[PDB]
Structure formats: C-alpha cells, structure tokens
Design a protein around this motif. Structure first.
Motif, PDB file in Angstrom:
ATOM      1  N   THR A  34       0.776  -1.192  -0.070  1.00  0.00           N
ATOM      2  CA  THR A  34      -0.039   0.048  -0.005  1.00  0.00           C
ATOM      3  C   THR A  34       0.892   1.395  -0.165  1.00  0.00           C
ATOM      4  O   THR A  34       0.185   2.364  -0.451  1.00  0.00           O
ATOM      5  CB  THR A  34      -0.997   0.146   1.274  1.00  0.00           C
ATOM      6  OG1 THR A  34      -0.175  -0.035   2.648  1.00  0.00           O
ATOM      7  CG2 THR A  34      -1.979  -1.115   1.499  1.00  0.00           C
ATOM      8  N   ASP A 271     -15.097  -3.468   3.202  1.00  0.00           N
ATOM      9  CA  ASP A 271     -15.444  -2.585   2.149  1.00  0.00           C
ATOM     10  C   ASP A 271     -15.041  -3.158   0.781  1.00  0.00           C
ATOM     11  O   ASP A 271     -14.025  -3.793   0.256  1.00  0.00           O
ATOM     12  CB  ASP A 271     -14.233  -1.558   2.492  1.00  0.00           C
ATOM     13  CG  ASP A 271     -14.095  -0.417   1.425  1.00  0.00           C
ATOM     14  OD1 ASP A 271     -14.952   0.543   1.451  1.00  0.00           O
ATOM     15  OD2 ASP A 271     -13.658  -0.680   0.365  1.00  0.00           O
ATOM     16  N   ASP A 273     -14.238  -2.000  -2.530  1.00  0.00           N
ATOM     17  CA  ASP A 273     -13.219  -1.626  -3.154  1.00  0.00           C
ATOM     18  C   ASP A 273     -12.089  -2.297  -2.632  1.00  0.00           C
ATOM     19  O   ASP A 273     -11.325  -2.571  -3.288  1.00  0.00           O
ATOM     20  CB  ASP A 273     -13.197  -0.309  -3.214  1.00  0.00           C
ATOM     21  CG  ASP A 273     -14.309   0.468  -4.001  1.00  0.00           C
ATOM     22  OD1 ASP A 273     -14.982   0.110  -5.012  1.00  0.00           O
ATOM     23  OD2 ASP A 273     -15.005   1.581  -3.372  1.00  0.00           O
ATOM     24  N   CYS A 274     -11.970  -2.394  -1.390  1.00  0.00           N
ATOM     25  CA  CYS A 274     -10.797  -3.007  -0.786  1.00  0.00           C
ATOM     26  C   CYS A 274     -10.715  -4.546  -1.162  1.00  0.00           C
ATOM     27  O   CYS A 274      -9.736  -4.915  -1.551  1.00  0.00           O
ATOM     28  CB  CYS A 274     -10.868  -2.775   0.722  1.00  0.00           C
ATOM     29  SG  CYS A 274     -10.400  -1.117   1.073  1.00  0.00           S
ATOM     30  N   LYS A 312      -7.590   4.252   1.536  1.00  0.00           N
ATOM     31  CA  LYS A 312      -8.721   4.420   0.871  1.00  0.00           C
ATOM     32  C   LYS A 312      -9.292   5.812   1.582  1.00  0.00           C
ATOM     33  O   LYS A 312      -9.928   6.823   0.791  1.00  0.00           O
ATOM     34  CB  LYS A 312      -9.707   3.463   0.798  1.00  0.00           C
ATOM     35  CG  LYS A 312     -11.053   3.903  -0.176  1.00  0.00           C
ATOM     36  CD  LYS A 312     -12.358   2.885   0.184  1.00  0.00           C
ATOM     37  CE  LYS A 312     -13.438   3.122  -0.765  1.00  0.00           C
ATOM     38  NZ  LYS A 312     -14.587   2.427  -0.572  1.00  0.00           N
ATOM     39  N   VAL A 318      -7.270   3.087  -4.531  1.00  0.00           N
ATOM     40  CA  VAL A 318      -7.561   1.797  -3.685  1.00  0.00           C
ATOM     41  C   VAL A 318      -6.619   0.959  -4.752  1.00  0.00           C
ATOM     42  O   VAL A 318      -6.942   0.001  -5.177  1.00  0.00           O
ATOM     43  CB  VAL A 318      -8.754   1.597  -3.845  1.00  0.00           C
ATOM     44  CG1 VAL A 318      -9.092   0.540  -2.892  1.00  0.00           C
ATOM     45  CG2 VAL A 318      -9.659   2.952  -3.497  1.00  0.00           C
TER      46      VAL A 318
END
Ligand SMILES: CN(C)C[C@H]1CC[C@H](N2C(=O)N(C)Cc3cnc4ccc(-c5cc(Cl)c(O)c(Cl)c5)nc4c32)CC1
Length: 321
Positions: A34, A271, A273-274, A312, A318
């Motif tokens: 990340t 979540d 999108d994660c 995010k 993301v």
C-alpha cells in the motif's frame, strides 16, 4: 537473527528507529503493497522471559480492542527469536510533548483531549479490560490530532505518580477504579502542567499519594475542581463511576452530548473496493478472499486489508503495488 527478519522484509521496508522502551524497539516502516507508513514494535523473545506472557496478553488485548482512540494492531509476526507487532503510526508524538510545549492546556483544550481519553478507557472497560498504566506518555496523536492509547503490557484481564493509593499500599484493587484515579491525575496534569503528587524521594511521594492532598491552582474553574475531587478519592469506592464520567456536567460543557465510547468501526461488512483489489493480488475468487479476511488472524492479509482501508479513507487510489 537474519532469518528472523526475512518474513518481515517481504512485507515492510524498515526506516529509522523512532523509540526504545524497556523490552521493545519501535521502528518506522513502510508497508510495501500500500505504501502506508506503520510503526513496528520489535521484541526479542529470549531477552524477556518473565514478561513473555505479558506480551501475549498485550497482543491478545490489542486484537480485542479495535477503537478510534486505541492504537490499532495490524499484524503479528512471530519468528524463532522475535515478535513483531505492526501498529498504527502516530506521527503527532506523545501527549507529554503537547502538554510540556504548551506549559499547560486551557480547560477547553483539556476537555477536547480528555473526552478522547474517557472514550478509550470506557471502551477498554466495556471489553473486560483495565489499562493500569494511563499516563501522557501512553497517549499519542496521529496526523489528524486524534489521541491513540498505547501500551497494554500492564493491562488486566505502573508509573508511580499516576498509581492509585491502594496499589501503593500493595492492596487488592479493581482495575477500573485504578484507571479512574490515573485519569484524575491526567486531568490535573493537562490543566496545570505539573503533577498533583510529586517528590524527589519515593517514600515521601508514597505518603503524599496516600494522603491525597494536592495544591489547587487559582486558574482552575470551580467545575474543574469538583471533577478532580470526584476522581481523586483515596477510597476507591467513592471515586466516580466510568458511567457517570461519560455524561458528567464538566464533560458535557460546550459539547452537550455524552462521550461516544463505542467503537466506530465494529465488525461490519468489508469494504467492497478493498476486497476487490485484494482479490486481484491473491489467485483466489472474491468470496474466498472475503472469507480469508473475516478470520482476522493478524497475518499479512489483515494488515494489507486494514491499511488499504486507511489508504482509501485518505483519498488515494485503492491500489496495491
Ligand atoms: C518508551 N515507551 C515505553 C514506549 C514508546 C515507544 C515509542 C513510541 N513512539 C514514539 O516515541 N515516537 C516518537 C513516534 C511514534 C509513532 N508511532 C507510534 C505508533 C505506535 C507506538 C506504540 C508503541 C508501543 Cl511500546 C505500544 O505498546 C503500542 Cl500499542 C504502540 N508508538 C509510536 C511512537 C512512544 C512510546
């Protein structure tokens, strides 16, 4: 050893040392996938022996305390000789620093800070724990000026100037009553810049704490004085309950709503999108990936998920490297 680090350096790149406690070294590091910065607490298992079960209680406690004002645990990695804890990075430094740089806080700035302390400690008690080492060195600011409680190595189920009288007598005590006393010391320090009980000689400071008398500076409002007296009671049965601290009139002033102590995150849904970006990096389908995250083993997947979530919230893509 070098092998103690090979798993860790698969996932993090180490930066400088930022702090050294008793049994631990804390390093700034970057989570590779990340790009998020984290703090890694490093402990050598051989060096620790008797407080090796202390660390396991600290870790077990941190996995059970997910809260907006408790330093979040991302990743536990144990090797033959080492135990690594990957934690929420708090670049804002210690509450100690904030106080000492301001000399002391006004009543308003105190309550901004103190409501966050009350929030964290009430949640800790709601989960069956007690911190038992509440003090400004164990409260850090993140980059958004939000407080984060740290160091659950002394948690139940200390620093002498913050310890309740009954602990100094070597007596039995309830963890929650001891936390309330320490928070009374914290509130005094926030508003005065010095301790209510202090002495260069430890026996003299034992006696000052058990007597319970402290100077009351003229700049303290009457309302501040009464809340101080209800928390700093030598008899733990006469100290204000945590329940009554949440909507205490001094707490409510300028806010008009009680301290929100419940965790803001819980164990809700993941979540979308994660988990979608995660599954694109793992040779698995989404349902399988959603199931893996829900086990919350505090392995590298837990860390990647939680830090992709934080990234995010930061307004950044993301995406994983
Ligand atoms: C000296 N004490 C016994 C510990 C000292 C360790 C360094 C820490 N720190 C610093 O001293 N900066 C200067 C920056 C800093 C930044 N982020 C951090 C994030 C997490 C933690 C942390 C440390 C420990 Cl020992 C924990 O148990 C937990 Cl749950 C969290 N410490 C941090 C930390 C301040 C306290």
């Amino acid at each position: 050893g070098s092998k103690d680090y090979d798993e860790l350096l698969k996932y993090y790149e180490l930066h400088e040392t930022i702090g050294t406690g008793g049994f631990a070294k804390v390093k700034l590091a970057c989570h590779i996938l990340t790009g998020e910065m984290v703090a890694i607490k490093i402990m050598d298992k051989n060096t620790l022996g008797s407080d090796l079960p202390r660390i396991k209680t600290e870790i077990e406690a941190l996995k059970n305390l997910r809260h907006q004002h408790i330093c979040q645990l991302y990743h536990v990695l144990e090797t033959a000789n080492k135990i690594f804890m990957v934690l929420e990075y708090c670049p804002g430094g210690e509450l100690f620093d904030y106080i000492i740089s301001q000399d002391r806080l006004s009543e308003e700035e105190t309550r901004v800070v103190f409501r966050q302390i009350v929030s964290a400690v009430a949640y800790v008690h709601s989960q069956g724990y007690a911190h038992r080492d509440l003090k400004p060195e164990n409260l850090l600011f993140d980059e958004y000026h939000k407080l984060k409680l740290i160091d659950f190595g002394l948690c139940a189920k200390g620093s002498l100037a913050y310890a309740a009288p009954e602990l100094i007598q070597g007596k039995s005590y309830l963890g929650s009553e001891a936390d309330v006393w320490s928070m009374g010391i914290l509130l005094y320090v926030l508003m005065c810049g010095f301790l209510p009980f202090d002495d260069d000689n430890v026996m003299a400071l034992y006696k000052k704490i058990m007597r319970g008398k402290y100077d009351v500076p003229k700049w303290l409002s009457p309302s501040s004085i009464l809340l101080l007296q209800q928390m700093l009671q030598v008899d733990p049965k006469k100290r204000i309950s945590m329940k009554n601290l949440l909507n205490h009139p001094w707490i409510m002033q300028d806010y008009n709503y009680p301290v929100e102590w419940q965790s803001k995150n819980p164990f809700i849904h993941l979540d979308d999108d994660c988990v979608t970006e995660l599954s694109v990096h793992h040779r698995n389908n989404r349902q399988t990936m959603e199931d893996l995250i829900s086990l919350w083993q505090y392995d590298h997947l837990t860390a990647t998920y939680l830090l992709l979530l934080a990234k995010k919230a930061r307004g950044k893509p993301v995406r994983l490297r």
